[PDB]
Each structure stands twice: as structure tokens, then as C-alpha cells.
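Teaching note: in complex prediction, the entire set of molecules is handled at once rather than each chain in isolation. The prompt given to students was simply: 'Predict the structure of this complex.' The entities are:
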Amino acid sequence: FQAKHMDQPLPTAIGLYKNHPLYALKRHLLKYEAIYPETAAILGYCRGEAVYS
DNA sequence: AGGTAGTCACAGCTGATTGCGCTGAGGATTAGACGTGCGATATCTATGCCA
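The expected output is the structure of the full assembly:
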């Protein structure tokens, strides 16, 4: 199941990247949660929105 | 027999008493998230325009 569902659909809708840890959009975080640019530079894009692990 | 020290009966000084105030411990007491509603906005394709 993990192998099948590892980034298979490849969604590119802004709403889908929210509350989705597999994508973890920078703008779709919380006040207390924050990205780490050291281990996440770029993994994908959606309407000019970068993806971080 | 004589006078002032010991003894007892009362006076000033001061501490305890009785109203009342104050602290210290002790037990009582709407702001980012999470969504949607509305509104501005990208977005895909029919199809007939005349060269």
C-alpha cells in the first residue's frame, strides 16, 4: 500500500496540500508548527507554492 | 522611765486587662484554530469569421 500510494496521484490543488503531511505546504502550517529549510529546500510546486517534507 | 526602729495601715507607680484596629496562610473563584459563504477569477472549447 505504501509503495502504491507514495505520491501516486500527484495532486496540484492548493486546498489539497492543506492538512496533508505527505506534502506539508509552508503556508498550510500552524502558528506553532514550522518547516526546516535545512532538510527541505524544494520537493514540488502547486500554483507557485513550494513543497517541504 | 525615755526615743526611735520594727510592724501594721494606708498611698503613688506601673503592669495587666478589655474593648478595638491591622498581614500571612488557605480555601473558593475570546485567540488562534476550524471550518464555510460569498465573491472575484482563472479556465477549457464550440465554430463559424474569411483568406
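Point out the following to students. Residues 2-5 of chain A form the longest helix (4 residues). Residues 30-31 of chain A lie near DNA strand B (CB under 10 Å from a C1').
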